[PDB]
Nucleic acid binder design. Structure first.
Lengths: 127, 137, 53, 191, 75, 141
RNA sequence: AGCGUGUGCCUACCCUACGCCGGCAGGCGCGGGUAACCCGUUGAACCCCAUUCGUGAUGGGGAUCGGGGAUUGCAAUUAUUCCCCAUGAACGAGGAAUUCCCAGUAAGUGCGGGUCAUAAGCUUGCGUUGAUUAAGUCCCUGCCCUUUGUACACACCGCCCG
């Protein structure tokens, strides 16, 4: 993730904005664009408070070797909004009994954590 | 008075000509009634008539407005795809292209494995609705 | 001291009861009486609510 | 208005119920001319009173049928006023006379009742009261007009005129006339 | 049944049919023109307002809902 | 005729046209695009309609002490088809009526009234009365 | 138009007219009101009407889904809700059955109150528009009136033969 091609090559622009550009602002300037539900949540969230979580993310991003994935970071904050600061990390996303483990691709942006950890079970009529 | 066409094609859909333009257009995927009504008003047509009537001229004029609506005093709120995301558009998807983007969007959140995606994949529901008693047949 | 021990109680069913009996269910909130219906039935005479039709 | 109390603009005088017995639950106005087929009308309390009610209004009321159309008297009054005009264009006359005639012609004289009959229940030919004859007729014509009008371009006022005119001189084109003959035919057997 | 398909634009010859017929009928409304020709209903309408020109046909009530026209003003 | 003398439809019809001739009213550039009410099914068939509303409002104010946009939204507001749910009131747009109110001011037909609400001006009062007469005069019929 | 409603509250908070911005949804600035004072001459909705449509599941219908805007809340993801667009389903009159009803009654039609932070397809009244139709009877059904029969009496949903 630094140099010509190397690693890079998945692209993704969010809202006309590029991930190069995305990864470089302030979460401020990201929510500014377009997302509207996620942005209100973080403003109102605010004061904001998943503080420690975000430090837990960067921490394990560091301690991860130099090639790949690493260990993950757990949470119950289903209502959290995915913002470029997060992308590339690994989130243990609780659903009531299980923590599903999910890498956050840049596409997810603006989505809520909960949308990637299914609570319910499909079901059954015959079987 | 006069005649002609019955049966005219715009951008990849066959549009019955007998029919009134506003209504006639609404065959095209992505042209609903509020759409087609405002597009035509923009496009200068005697509202009073049948799609089969009118000129090749007026037709391109409808299409041109239809795929650049913003550029014609059509507000964005009137539009199908605001806020793209992938490009941060605004847009108004049209024709064959609506089926396309529908597919994309479903794929997107199926790749990401989000519960909605999963729901679409099994062919259940994604808005919060009870699944115990209905949509059974 | 135990910062631990509360989450919002401002509004909803959970923010109120029966001044008579604690019950957070079937609560008469009109005219500020704030009695559960079962109780209000038993106290409507002493409050001044009388049957006429 | 002051000379004679006409209808929307039609004269009550000189219309004669061409049918003894019926005379009189068909209420024109052996003095009662009014202006409009709408009234406060309390007919319900008594069994008879309905007869008092002007036949025109009676016809207008039957018009507003089917759950959606219930209570739409203004709509019926509007339809009735139009129908009379269409009828008039079609034959001069008093359309009110035309209306009365259709009513006189449609009431089933004879009918049938489902007499218990033991088993294979047979049906007993009985004669029919004049109140019933009037009541039944107005239905028949209204149901006739309403039924015809529904999938066709033509309006109730028009379909009503058509049902009324055909019936006034019993053309048998009419739904109602065919129905009445059917009810009566049934009455005769059974006996 | 009753499937109705309508000629929704003027065909000359159908223009002639209109002025050389409609004086025939005593009653003409949207429906008449539609059934007796094979006029749109939309192009019925425009034919009514036109016909009332200086009329082939004569107004006796055009209640919002309904025009009701008579034969022209003959003997 | 007082404006009260003329039937509402002809009065509004005549005045609305008069406004059209005058050529100076002014018009949120939109008006091509706008529905006029969320309740609304389609916009107005007469894209020309901005004038008609203006006339309608001018007449509406002249009648009464003072009125404001909320009232108009509701007046214009029709019943909205909830779909599954039963139908309910939905007071009609506020931009159109406001713009109508602002524009009318430009002509001086109406002016801010005391204690909120726009009132007709004597200039407007005179203007409406004048057209009212013209309409009455036209003919019998 | 009508029954009704409100803040200054057992502990967090009201009803809101009016100016501006926004297509909308809504945003924003004010100012009154313990109310017969103010919101609200509740300027409601059906409806009435001048047009269009034209008998095509079409403009009847608004399902499902996609994207997006905003409001409530610390938190809405399992959509609280609302809007805007788009996608534009079945349904073209309902078998066996079966509810309820006699005059402001049936039915259409909006409103307000309860729930309530937010959230109505609900319930619970209210006015508006307003018929058809018995005017009675005990047939079916249900329940109580005599007389009568009864091996019944946990009472016919009861107590019988090989």
């Amino acid at each position: 993730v630094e140099q010509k091609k190397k690693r890079t090559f998945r692209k993704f622009t969010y809202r006309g904005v590029d991930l190069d550009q995305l990864l470089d602002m302030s979460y401020e300037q990201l929510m500014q664009l377009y997302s509207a539900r996620q942005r209100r949540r973080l403003s109102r969230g605010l004061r904001r408070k998943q503080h420690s979580l975000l430090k837990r993310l960067r921490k394990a991003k560091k301690e991860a070797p130099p090639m790949e994935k690493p260990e993950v970071v757990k949470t119950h904050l289903r209502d959290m909004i995915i913002l470029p600061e997060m992308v590339g990390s690994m989130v243990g996303v609780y659903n009531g009994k299980t923590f599903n483990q999910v890498e956050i691709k840049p596409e997810m942006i603006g989505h809520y954590l909960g949308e990637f950890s299914i609570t319910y079970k499909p079901v059954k009529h015959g079987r | 008075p006069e005649k002609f066409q019955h049966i005219l094609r715009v951008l990849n859909t066959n549009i019955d000509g007998r029919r009134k333009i506003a209504f006639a257009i609404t065959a095209i995927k992505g042209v609903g009634r509020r759409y087609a009504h405002v597009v035509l008003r923009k496009a200068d047509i005697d509202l009073t008539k049948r799609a089969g009537e009118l000129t090749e001229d007026e037709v391109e004029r409808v299409i041109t407005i239809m795929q650049n609506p913003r550029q014609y005093k059509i507000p964005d709120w009137f539009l199908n795809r605001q806020k793209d995301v992938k490009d941060g558009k605004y847009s108004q998807v049209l024709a064959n292209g609506l089926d396309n983007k529908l597919r994309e969007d479903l794929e997107r959140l199926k790749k990401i494995r989000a519960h909605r995606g999963l729901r679409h994949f099994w062919g259940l529901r994604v808005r919060g609705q009870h699944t115990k008693t209905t949509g059974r047949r | 001291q135990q910062l631990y021990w509360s989450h919002p109680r401002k509004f909803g069913q959970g923010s109120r009861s029966c001044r008579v009996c604690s019950n957070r269910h079937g609560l008469i909130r009109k005219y500020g009486l704030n009695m559960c219906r079962q109780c209000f039935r038993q106290y409507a005479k002493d409050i001044g609510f009388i049957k006429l039709d | 208005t002051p000379d004679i109390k006409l209808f929307g603009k039609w004269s009550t005088d000189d219309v004669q119920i061409n049918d003894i017995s019926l005379q009189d639950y068909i209420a024109v106005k052996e003095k009662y001319a009014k202006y409009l087929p709408h009234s406060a009308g309390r007919y319900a309390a008594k069994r008879f009173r309905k007869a008092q009610c002007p036949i025109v209004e009676r016809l207008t009321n039957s018009m507003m049928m089917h759950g959606r159309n219930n209570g739409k008297k203004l709509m019926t009054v509007r339809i009735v006023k139009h129908a009379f005009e269409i009828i008039h264009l079609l034959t001069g006359e008093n359309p009110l006379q035309v209306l009365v005639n259709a009513i006189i012609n449609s009431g089933p004289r004879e009918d049938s009742t489902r007499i218990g009959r033991a088993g294979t229940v047979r049906r007993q030919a009985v004669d029919v009261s004049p109140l019933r004859r009037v009541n039944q007729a107005i239905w028949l014509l209204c149901t006739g007009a309403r039924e015809a009008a529904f999938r066709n371009i033509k309006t109730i006022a028009e379909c009503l005129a058509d049902e009324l005119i055909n019936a006034a001189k019993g053309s048998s084109n009419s739904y109602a006339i065919k129905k009445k003959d059917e009810l009566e035919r049934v009455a005769k057997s059974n006996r | 049944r009753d499937k109705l398909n309508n000629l929704v634009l003027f065909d000359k010859a159908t223009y002639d049919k209109l002025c050389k017929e409609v004086p025939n009928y005593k009653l003409i409304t949207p429906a008449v023109v539609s059934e007796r020709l094979k006029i749109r209903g939309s192009l019925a309408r425009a034919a009514l307002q036109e016909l009332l020109s200086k009329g082939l046909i004569k107004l006796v009530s055009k209640h919002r809902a309904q025009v009701i026209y008579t034969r022209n003003t003959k003997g | 005729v007082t404006v009260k003398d003329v039937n509402q439809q002809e009065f509004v019809r005549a005045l609305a046209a008069f406004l059209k001739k005058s050529g100076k009213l002014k018009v949120p550039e939109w008006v091509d695009t706008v529905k006029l009410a969320k309740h609304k099914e389609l916009a107005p068939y007469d894209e020309n309609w901005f004038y008609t509303r203006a006339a309608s409002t001018a007449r509406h104010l002249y009648l009464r002490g003072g009125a404001g946009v909320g009232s108009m939204t509701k007046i214009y507001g029709g019943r909205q088809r909830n779909g599954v749910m039963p139908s309910h009131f939905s007071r009609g747009s506020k931009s159109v009526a406001r713009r109508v109110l602002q524009a009318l001011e430009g002509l001086k037909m109406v002016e801010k009234d005391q204690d909120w609400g726009r009132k007709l001006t004597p200039q407007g009062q005179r203007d409406l009365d004048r057209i009212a007469g013209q309409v009455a005069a036209a003919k019998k019929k």
